[PDB]
């Protein structure tokens, strides 16, 4: 039957290595495509991470479903917000830059 849990687990490690590939690459070659990738990976990695934390500590039927939804909303918003920030503002790379030569 479905081999979903193993896929989710593998997926996680894939974005993990991806997120780790991006951080140095974003430094060296700061462009827009690097801003979005960072937004995608950062919030997806983040989303799955809190996922595990929730699934560990949040005990109960309808109470876990709820967190899983609250976290779903949080992520979508986080991802849109960063996407907005990239399109209509400075963008992650350049923001970090400005922030740092300070």
């Amino acid at each position: 039957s479905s081999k979903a849990a193993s896929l989710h687990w593998t997926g996680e490690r894939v974005v993990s290595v991806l997120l780790l590939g991006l951080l140095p690459a974003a430094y060296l070659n700061p462009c827009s495509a690097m801003d979005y990738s960072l937004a995608a990976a950062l919030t997806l990695h983040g989303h799955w991470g809190i996922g595990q934390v929730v699934t560990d500590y949040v005990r109960g039927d309808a109470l876990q479903k709820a967190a899983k939804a609250g976290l779903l909303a949080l992520s979508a918003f986080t991802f849109a917000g960063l996407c907005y920030f990239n399109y209509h503002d400075v963008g992650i790379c350049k923001a970090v830059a400005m922030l740092w030569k300070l």
């Binding site: 039957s1 479905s2 081999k3 979903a4 849990a5 193993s6 989710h8 687990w9 593998t10 595990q52 699934t55 560990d56 500590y57």
Partner: protein
């Protein structure tokens, strides 16, 4: 004379309104075997015979006397008493377990989990069994070393915070290592399906590689390392 203090976790299910307290004893190490169980047996036999705990083998293969001694889960019959008199031995039952009566923890769920992974040789064609001996190379046999030696003492699982929080659905290191034991036993035919039994967010995947298990095992085994090996099989098997 050499007097050593022991502080042990107490609770009586038959005494009304009793709560978990610590009783202190004192043992002359001059007149006692070098291990913690020797001490336990000695206070039980001489000081107070209410002290209730599991034991059988005295040499650390039965796994009966498992308990949290001075922070860590081990076997009391296999760990030496700290000859340091300026220290008091704090003894507790296995962590995060229902205490039946002091030091004696309900392992029903533990054993049930073990049962749930079918820890025995499974064959597709079971009609030739008992007739001839199965062949297994010296190399194929080695893969079982450091896995078959498990005592089902529960020190490891009972040390995994993931097992604390999630004892109901998460199988734990002891059980998971035995699933793996059968997975790579070349005589077994049901590897692909033993894997599939783990395809949920809980049974295996509550392991976040904390490694208390391996670090605590009274027998030198490596449950965590085996969980790793399971996880890579899960990620790679075909069907």
């Amino acid at each position: 004379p050499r007097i050593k203090k022991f502080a042990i976790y107490r609770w009586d299910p038959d005494k009304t309104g009793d709560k978990p307290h610590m009783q202190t004893y004192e043992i002359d190490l001059n007149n006692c075997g070098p291990m913690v169980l020797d001490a336990l047996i000695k206070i039980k036999n001489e000081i107070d015979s209410t002290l209730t705990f599991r034991r059988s083998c005295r040499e650390g293969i039965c796994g009966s006397c498992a308990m949290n001694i001075n922070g860590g889960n081990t076997l009391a019959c296999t760990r030496r008493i700290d000859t340091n008199l300026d220290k008091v031995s704090k003894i507790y039952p296995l962590p995060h377990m229902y205490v039946i009566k002091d030091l004696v923890p309900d392992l029903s769920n533990f054993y049930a989990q073990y049962k749930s992974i079918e820890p025995y040789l499974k064959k597709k064609d079971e009609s030739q069994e008992g007739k001839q001996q199965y062949l297994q190379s010296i190399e194929e046999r080695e893969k079982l070393d450091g896995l078959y030696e498990c005592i089902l003492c529960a020190c490891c699982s009972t040390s995994c915070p993931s097992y604390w929080w999630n004892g109901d659905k998460y199988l734990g290191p002891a059980v998971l290592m035995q699933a793996y034991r059968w997975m790579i036993d070349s005589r077994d035919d049901f590897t692909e399906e033993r894997l599939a039994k783990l395809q949920d967010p809980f049974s295996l995947y509550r392991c976040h590689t904390i490694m208390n298990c391996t670090g605590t095992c009274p027998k030198g085994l490596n449950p965590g390392k085996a969980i790793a090996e399971i996880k890579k099989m899960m990620a790679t098997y075909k069907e």
